[PDB]
Predict the structure.
Amino acid sequence: SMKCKFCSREAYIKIHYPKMYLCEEHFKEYFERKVSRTIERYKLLTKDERILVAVSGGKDSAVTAYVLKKLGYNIECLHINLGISGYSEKSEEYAKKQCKLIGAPLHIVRIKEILGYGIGEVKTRRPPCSYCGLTKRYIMNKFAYDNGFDAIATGHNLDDEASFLLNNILHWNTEYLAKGGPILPQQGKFIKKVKPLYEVTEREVVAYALAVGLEYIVEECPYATTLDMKGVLNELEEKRPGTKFNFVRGYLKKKKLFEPEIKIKECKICRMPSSGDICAFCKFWGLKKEINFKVSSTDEEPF
Amino acid sequence: MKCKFCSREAYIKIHYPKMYLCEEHFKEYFERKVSRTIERYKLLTKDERILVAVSGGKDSAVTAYVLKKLGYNIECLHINLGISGYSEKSEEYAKKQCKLIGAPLHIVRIKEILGYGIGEVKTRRPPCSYCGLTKRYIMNKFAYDNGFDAIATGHNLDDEASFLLNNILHWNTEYLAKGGPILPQQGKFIKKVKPLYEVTEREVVAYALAVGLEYIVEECPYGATTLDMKGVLNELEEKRPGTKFNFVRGYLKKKKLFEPEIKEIKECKICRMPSSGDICAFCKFWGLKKEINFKVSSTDEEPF
Ligand code: SF4
Ligand code: SF4
Ligand SMILES: [Zn+2]
Ligand SMILES: [Zn+2]
Ligand SMILES: [Zn+2]
Ligand SMILES: [Zn+2]
């Protein structure tokens, strides 16, 4: 029903804030420039850096890898196959597809193969959601550490951070609120984690994926409070535009207030940053040996 | 359904904790819940002169009704904002409420003591901004001049949760530093309490209906952000019950974290009330040269 603000081509998307109608080609350029600005603003990455993009098969990580590669970054991708039968199989396939289109090396880690059982197979009263996050985070860091990557880039966008903030404020998880934001610096054996999509919304991600022809898993894991928070914040954004941004940017200014609400050791098994004698990952899976994630070359590209 | 304690038919269902109560059992429960809030946060004693700031709305009406039923030494104050077509019936609803409650009502008319009502001032500033400042001053000055020990407001759980949610979204750390059910006596500032702090609006609406309390449902003409936050929190309460309470109680524990975000106090050159500069915010705004004396010998309805 409209036309592009910079050309005679028909409008593809309307940016709710700031108001402007852009076509496919102009939206891509805008979205890419918005990401580059997020990198520049928070000093996330340099061009002389080995980056590991944690791809899951979803839209978020797919676009992160695509944009970073288009912006000329030294990226490689990692897929952690959780081993959820009927889910994780096509999830691995979507990532292979995504990385082939992107033109980036893809490394695959299969939980069922290295640990024994997949997520939702462990004889535990603990929900799969609780230990899945802990398992994904460990393999992400250990893989990047063992292969000497400078940084880890996740798919987490503005909607993801706002819903994370809203949930944590409601439950007053001050320790989690203390360590949030677009960058988590290199501290010990913990690799620097960045969020290049921190300032963009899910609608801009969905639209970007569609335009660049990126296929992803829309369906979410069978084992959620996240979708509740996101809908609540979308309702608020309708009435008052800019809410999500002003809330997230405001949080970054006041993030210093939660510092006294947060407190160290090295694991006896994997030597990774632990709280006690043995780390949370090693204690859970009952591991006696260290998983070595060092690889000479990818599955698709050996030698 | 039927009542959990008698053969009488259910009047209301408490979403958390789950129980069906009749009119007579709900009143008793609601009253006990308020008494517990008083006891828990050490809000009031029986040997205290209390001023309930009644507005004509459900909140302040119930606060006065419950406190009087719990045997407290209450007197009520109505601040008539002078909003033509609104403030007139608002004053009438309070007169009605206090007559039912059986409490002395003191009326202060803005248009009469200041000159112009709220929304009549030649200012680009919205009426909502200076109305709150004006209500707060008269509330404190009246309680101070008549030597009341405390001020009790109608603010309930939904009011606090929406206040918290809005202030967190705008990261107003200074406002978040000084929240909660009690604001103690500091200088010429009178102790402010919230006896309805733990009860929800649905429990207030139901209590008013049961005790036969008529109030103004309609809100002031001067879009309000409060109704947005409340609807958002009601949506959250549906899916996850107890959310509002766990969020408010959790805030009280972490309230200490916003203390470094609030930094000497002065006395006004005109009214001698707690000021930031030479002249206070109230006196500077209305351009007052003289001090308004709120000391009264006896009420409008009960003179001599
Ligand atoms: S939603 Fe699924 S993938 Fe995400 S943390 Fe939970 S179990 Fe793991
Ligand atoms: S909503 Fe009306 S009564 Fe309430 S503070 Fe604003 S102007 Fe005053
Ligand atoms: Zn265009
Ligand atoms: Zn370990
Ligand atoms: Zn009953
Ligand atoms: Zn003054």
In short: The pocket of zinc ion (ligand 4) is lined by residues A 267, 269-270, 272, 278-279, 281-282 (CB under 6 Å).
